[PDB]
Amino acid sequence: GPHMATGQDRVVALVDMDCFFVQVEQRQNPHLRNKPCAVVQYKSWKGGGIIAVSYEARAFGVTRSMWADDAKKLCPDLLLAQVRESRGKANLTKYREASVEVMEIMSRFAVIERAAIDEAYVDLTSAVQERLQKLQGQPISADLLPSTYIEGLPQGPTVQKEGMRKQGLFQWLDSLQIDNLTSPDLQLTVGAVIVEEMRAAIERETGFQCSAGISHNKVLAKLACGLNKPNRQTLVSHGSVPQLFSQMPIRKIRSLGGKLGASVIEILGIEYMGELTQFTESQLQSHFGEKNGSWLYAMCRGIEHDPVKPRQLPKTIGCSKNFPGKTALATREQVQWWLLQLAQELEERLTKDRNDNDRVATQLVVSIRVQGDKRLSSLRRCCALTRYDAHKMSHDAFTVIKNCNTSGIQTEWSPPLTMLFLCATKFSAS
DNA sequence: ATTTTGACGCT
Ligand SMILES: [Ca+2]
Ligand SMILES: [Mg+2]
Numbered sequence: 001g002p003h004m005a006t007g008q009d010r011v012v013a014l015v016d017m018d019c020f021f022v023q024v025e026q027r028q029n030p031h032l033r034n035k036p037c038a039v040v041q042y043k044s045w046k047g048g049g050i051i052a053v054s055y056e057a058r059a060f061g062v063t064r065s066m067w068a069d070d071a072k073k074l075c076p077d078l079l080l081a082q083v084r085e086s087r088g089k090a091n092l093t094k095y096r097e098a099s100v101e102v103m104e105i106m107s108r109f110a111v112i113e114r115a116a117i118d119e120a121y122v123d124l125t126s127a128v129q130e131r132l133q134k135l136q137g138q139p140i141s142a143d144l145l146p147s148t149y150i151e152g153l154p155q156g157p158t159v160q161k162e163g164m165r166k167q168g169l170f171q172w173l174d175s176l177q178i179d180n181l182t183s184p185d186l187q188l189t190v191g192a193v194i195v196e197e198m199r200a201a202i203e204r205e206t207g208f209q210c211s212a213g214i215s216h217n218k219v220l221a222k223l224a225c226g227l228n229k230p231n232r233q234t235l236v237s238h239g240s241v242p243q244l245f246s247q248m249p250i251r252k253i254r255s256l257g258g259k260l261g262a263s264v265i266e267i268l269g270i271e272y273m274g275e276l277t278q279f280t281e282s283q284l285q286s287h288f289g290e291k292n293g294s295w296l297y298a299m300c301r302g303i304e305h306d307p308v309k310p311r312q313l314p315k316t317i318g319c320s321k322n323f324p325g326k327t328a329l330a331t332r333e334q335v336q337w338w339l340l341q342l343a344q345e346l347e348e349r350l351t352k353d354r355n356d357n358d359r360v361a362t363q364l365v366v367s368i369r370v371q372g373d374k375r376l377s378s379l380r381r382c383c384a385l386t387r388y389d390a391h392k393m394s395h396d397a398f399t400v401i402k403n404c405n406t407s408g409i410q411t412e413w414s415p416p417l418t419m420l421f422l423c424a425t426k427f428s429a430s
Numbered sequence: 431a432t433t434t435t436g437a438c439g440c441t
Contacts, residue, residue, distance in 0.1 A: 041433060049432040065432055083434095090434065116436070291439090316436065324431045423436095 007216050007303030008184035008238050011191035013122040014221035015106060015198065017210045018230035020118035021052035024098045025081035027207045036060060037079035040068045041090040047072065048082065055230050087341040089321045092117075093349075101206050103312050109198050113309045121218050122198070123308035124191045131190050132181050139178045142169055144193045149228045152240040165228075172235075185237055188214055192235045199233065217304035222254050241302035245274035253299065260292065276300030313357055318423035319345050320367075328371050328416030332405070335413055335420070336398055342422045343394035350388050350424055361385050361424035366397040368404065369419035377421070379404060385424055397422060 017023065021039040026032045036057035040048035047068030060075035071078055083090045099117045106112045110127050112120040153168030177183055192214045203209055212233040213224025223244075224236035236244065250273055251261045265271060267287050268279065276284070277300050285293025298304060319342050329335045354360055364385040370378045381400040385393065407414040 045431060051433075067432080092434070114436095314436065318435065320434060322431085322433060324433095327431095421434095 005303065006184075006238060007298070007301070007305070009125075010216055011124040011128045011187050011214065012217055012221045012308060013124055013191060013195050013198075013212055013214045014115070014218065014225045015120050015122060015195070015202075015210050015212045016225050016229075017102060017118040017208055019052050019054050020098075020208070021083075021095050022054045022081075023208050024095055026054070029081065032079050032081060035079050036062070036075050036077060037081065038062060038068070038071060039083060040080050041083040042085075043068075043082060046070070048080070051083070087345055088338070089319070089341060089345070091345065098206070098208070102202055102208060102210075105202050105205055106198060107312055108201075109194060111308060111310045112312055114312050114314065120312075121221065121308045122195070124194055124214075125187075127194055128187050128190045131194060132187070135178075135190075137179050140173060140176065140189055140193065142166070142173055145169055145173075145189075145196060147196065147199070147232050148192050149232060149234045150240075151224060151227055151234055151236045152243055184216065185239070188216070188235055188237055192233060195233055216302070218306050218308065219254050219299060219304045220302060223248075223252065238302055242274060245300060245302075246272060248273045250276075260288065264288065264296070273300050315427070316423050316425045317346065317349050317353060317361065318365075318421065319349075320419065320421035322369075322419050323417060328418045329420075330413050330416045332411050332413055335401075335417060336394065338420055339394040339397050339422070340390065342420055343390040343397065346393060346422050346424060347388050347390040354388065354430060358430055359427040360388075360430040361427050363424070363426035364393055364396060365421075365423040365425055366400050367419070367421035367423070368401055368417050370404070370415045371418050372415060377419070382425075393422065 022037060025039055037054045038050045038057055039052040040050050042048045050064055050066045050068055050071055053062045053064060057075055057078055062071045062075050062078060068080060084094060085091060095117060103112060103114060103120060106120055106122065111123045114120055148169060149165055150168045150172040153171050154164065158164060158167060176186055176189060178186060180186065195212045195214055199210055199212060209231045211225050211229045211231065213221040213236060214233065215221045215224050215236040216238060220236050224234040227234040249271060250264055251257045253273055256264065276296055281294060281297040284296045288296060321338060321342065323329050329338065350361060362385055363382055365380060365382045367377045367380045369376065383396045383400050405413050
C-alpha cells in the first residue's frame with residue numbers, strides 16, 4: 001500500500017537510431033534514400049554479409065545476418081552499400097564518427113549512457129522538473145507530441161495508423177492532471193515532449209531519424225522504443241505495465257533473450273513476463289540466484305533501479321577478424337601479419353581517441369579462437385599497453401599467444417586460428 | 431561462412 005515502491009521516481013528515455021548504418025550510407029549517397037537497401041561487409045562470399053537493412057527492404061523479408069545473394073533472391077532491386085575495407089579488414093570508422101555526431105547532440109539535453117553505437121539511454125528526471133517549473137501548470141498540447149504513441153491507448157467506448165495514434169494521445173492528455181507537479185504520468189509526458197525536441201534536433205543537425213521509448217527505467221524505455229518503429233516514440237507508463245506484460249514473451253525483455261530467459265520459461269512453466277508476478281521473491285531467487293531473482297521480482301512489476309550511467313564514450317577500443325574455414329591461419333608469419341594489421345588499425349583509433357578525449361589505454365587484451373572450439377573465444381591473455389605503437393602491440397600480442405601453437409614445426413601454426421582480437425582497455429586520464 | 435564489435439557478471 002502506502003509503502004510499496006512503484007518505480008516511478010525517474011524519467012528515462014532510450015533513443016535508437018533507425019537502421020543506423022543504412023542511414024549513414026543514405027545520407028552520403030542520396031541515390032539510396034527511400035529505397036530497399038542494406039549495408040554489407042565484404043562481397044566475395046555469397047555477396048557479403050548484411051549487417052543493416054532499411055525498412056523498405058525489411059518489407060521484403062531482408063534481415064541482418066543474411067547473405068546478400070539470398071537477400072537479392074527476396075528483393076531483386078535491393079541496393080547495397082559496402083563497409084569500407086582497410087588493412088585487409090572491415091573498418092567501422094564512418095559509423096563510429098556518425099555515432100559521435102548523434103551522442104554529442106543528445107548530451108546537450110541530458111546525461112546520456114552510450115549503450116551501443118546507435119543507442120543511448122537518457123536520464124530526463126532533472127530536465128523534466130525544470131520544464132514543469134517553466135510551464136506554470138499550463139496544459140500540454142498534442143501539438144507538442146506529434147510522433148508519440150501512448151502504449152495501451154486508445155481503449156474503451158478510424159482505421160488509419162495515425163488516427164489511432166492521435167486517438168490514444170487525446171485520451172491520455174484528456175485524462176492528465178497537469179496541476180500536480182509530482183504526478184509520474186505528467187512527468188513521463190513532459191519527458192516525451194523533451195524527447196520529441198531531442199529527436200527533432202538530431203534529425204535537423206544530422207539528417208538521421210530515430211525512435212525512442214520514454215518510461216520510468218531503462219528496461220521499460222528500451223521495450224517501449226521497439227513498439228513503434230521507425231521514426232516514432234512510445235510512452236510506456238507504469239499503469240500500462242500489467243496489460244503490456246500480460247502477453248509479452250519473456251525473451252523480449254532486455255537480458256532475458258538468452259539462456260536465463262529460457263531457464264525462466266522452462267523451470268517456471270510460463271511464457272509471458274506478467275506471469276512472473278505469481279512467484280515470491282524468495283522463489284525467484286531460489287531458481288535464478290539472489291540478484292537475478294530480486295531483479296525479476298521487481299521487473300515483472302515494471303520496477304528497475306539500474307542507473308543511467310554518465311558515460312558517453314566507449315570503455316574499450318577493439319578490433320577483430322574471423323578467419324573461417326579454409327582461411328584459418330596456419331603459418332606463424334600469417335598470424336603475425338594479421339596481428340600487425342589489427343594493431344595498426346588499433347593504433348590509429350587509439351591515437352585519435354587520446355587526442356579527442358584526454359585519456360590513454362593501459363591494457364592490451366589479446367583473444368584468439370582455435371579451429372574446432374565452439375566457443376567464440378578459445379583464449380584471452382592481457383599485457384601492458386605502454387606505447388601507442390602498432391609494431392610493439394603486435395609483437396606483444398604474439399608474445400602472449402605464441403605458446404598456444406601446438407605444432408612441433410617452427411613456421412607452422414596448429415591448431416589453425418579462426419579469430420584474432422586486440423582490445424585496448426583500462427583507460428586513465430591523460 | 432555472419433562479422434565486428436561492446437558492456438557486464440562470475441569465480
Ligand atoms: Ca537502431
Ligand atoms: Mg540499436
